[PDB]
Write a protein that binds this ligand. Structure first.
Ligand code: HEM
Ligand SMILES: CN(C)Cc1ccc(-c2cccnc2)o1
Length: 465
């Protein structure tokens, strides 16, 4: 054919806005999909975007044509602060250099090794202390979980953890929570279409920008301090390593290693390494309370494999297929980043029988893959069996793509999985979960869905086992 995937006819500037509900972008797009097919074109305001629904379409593009779909598209709210700098929301050589450096440096600081495993186990011990500190009282688990998760990536990028009582630490965590929420609201999704006008208007979006600026200012301040105390021969953290590279690249006019990329890359890792794992833990505990039978089976496995005294360790996962299936099912059901981070084609592309001109933005609908009816028997239910065969052994799925896939896939995946396993296992070894309401009445549908999937606010109690 040589034409763009088909889709609803757009109007000048507003695009397909009148055919979408900003409060329910995923549903709006899936509905349109029913009429046009799994691969179609939508206009988010002036942004022409090719939407990919279901496993095959997503894998065929992002993996079978990985290089062609390896460009980074827009996320207007994050782009407000990043402006094309840093490692996530950037493109070309800049992204390429920053990604190679970040992965190497994260490994240098223990990621994927015993070094970060020990860091996570230690922070998990501090979480257990904090939960015991509540005395079994009903509490909002939100910041208990985020403080613990954030301290892992914080020890890597800033060299030391934050004290749980540090008020500024709480403030940064509120900024992250607030920005993920804003991007998942109707206004945050309206912003994705009309940022050209909205970035200049009063409104909720301005408060969101101020939370991003607050996070940026905090990182700039930390960088300054490291700068004046830096030992080129003994880096303390991610920031020092980057400062050293900047030093070594000072004679290169075209280097990507300069202050703005240092600040933005560090900001990407601080927010990235915090909010998504935190949200997943929070959703996870809610699902476990909605499903006591699953919690009960987790406890049998933990007591048998690990016991009551030693701390869980990452190698324990190989002997714990049920917990591994449970964590996969939480990520599959949570669908935390439902439309991934937009990609864009690097050059003119032929995909299936369509034509995608260079620069065209792409929405890989991860959530449509995680709930693909050809890969999961009951996609709309929380059921760990989705990841187990008949002998209760762990069974992988090609449709398990919460970290996306391809050339710009999440390089925080190994760290995330290690955190999820050790935090879920250590909490559940130590506590049984008590909801403030009957399981039948627990509502696990999300509170907001847009850029992220946000669970409803809730309180619960952690009772020692
Ligand atoms: C449950 C946790 C997490 C989920 C579900 C998740 C998900 C994702 C997704 C869907 C993307 C976009 C991938 C693409 O464009 O194809 C992404 C990218 C990225 N993630 Fe994560 N992530 C998680 C944790 C983390 C953590 C802990 C870190 C940090 C160490 C991190 C760092 C990044 C970075 C730097 C990128 C951008 C990669 C690039 O542009 O080349 N993520 N993540
Ligand atoms: C890190 N993973 C979770 C991908 C992801 C979702 C949202 C963001 C993110 C948002 C602001 C700054 N840096 C990164 O990054």
């Amino acid at each position: 054919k040589g034409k763009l995937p088909p889709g609803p006819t757009p109007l000048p500037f507003i695009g397909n806005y009148l055919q979408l509900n900003t409060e329910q972008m995923y549903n709006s797009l899936m509905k349109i999909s029913e009429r046009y097919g799994p691969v179609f074109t939508i206009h988010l305001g002036p942004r022409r975007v090719v939407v990919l629904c279901g496993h095959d379409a997503v894998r065929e593009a992002l993996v079978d044509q990985a290089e062609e779909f390896s460009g980074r598209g827009e996320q207007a709210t994050f782009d407000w602060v990043f402006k094309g700098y840093g490692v996530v929301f950037s493109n070309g050589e800049r992204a390429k250099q920053l990604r190679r450096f970040s992965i190497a440096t994260l490994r240098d600081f223990g990621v994927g090794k015993r070094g970060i495993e020990e860091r996570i186990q230690e922070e998990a011990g501090f979480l257990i202390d904090a939960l015991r500190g509540t005395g079994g009282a009903n509490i909002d688990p939100t910041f208990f979980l985020s403080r613990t998760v954030s301290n892992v990536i914080s020890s890597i990028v800033f060299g030391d953890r934050f004290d749980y009582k540090d008020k500024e630490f709480l403030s940064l965590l509120r900024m992250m929570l607030g920005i993920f929420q804003f991007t998942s609201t109707s206004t945050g999704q309206l912003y994705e279409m009309f940022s050209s006008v909205m970035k200049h208007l009063p409104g909720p979006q301005q408060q969101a920008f101020q939370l991003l600026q607050g996070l940026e200012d905090f990182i700039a301040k930390k960088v300054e301090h490291n700068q004046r105390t830096l030992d080129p021969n003994s880096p303390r953290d991610f920031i020092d390593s980057f400062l050293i590279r900047m030093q070594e690249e000072e004679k290169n006019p075209n280097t990507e290693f300069y202050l703005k990329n240092l600040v933005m890359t560090t900001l990407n890792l601080f927010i990235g390494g915090t909010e998504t794992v935190s949200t997943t833990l929070r959703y996870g505990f809610l699902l476990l309370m909605k499903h006591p039978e699953v919690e009960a089976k987790v406890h049998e496995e933990i007591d048998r494999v690990i016991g009551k005294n030693r701390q869980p360790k990452f190698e324990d996962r190989a002997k714990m297929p049920y917990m591994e299936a449970v964590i996969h099912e939480i990520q599959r059901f949570g669908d935390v980043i439902p439309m991934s981070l937009a990609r864009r084609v690097k050059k003119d592309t032929k995909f299936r029988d369509f034509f995608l001109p260079k620069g065209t933005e792409v929405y890989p609908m991860l959530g449509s893959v995680l709930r693909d009816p050809s890969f999961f028997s009951n996609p709309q239910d929380f059921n760990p069996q989705h990841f187990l065969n008949e002998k209760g052994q762990f069974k992988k799925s090609d449709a398990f793509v919460p970290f996306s896939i391809g050339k710009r896939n999440c390089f925080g995946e190994g760290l995330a999985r290690m955190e999820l396993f050790l935090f879920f296992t250590t909490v559940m070894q130590n506590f049984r979960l008590k909801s403030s309401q009957s399981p039948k009445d627990i509502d696990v549908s999300p509170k907001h869905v847009g850029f992220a999937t946000i669970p409803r606010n809730y309180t619960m109690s952690f009772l020692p086992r």
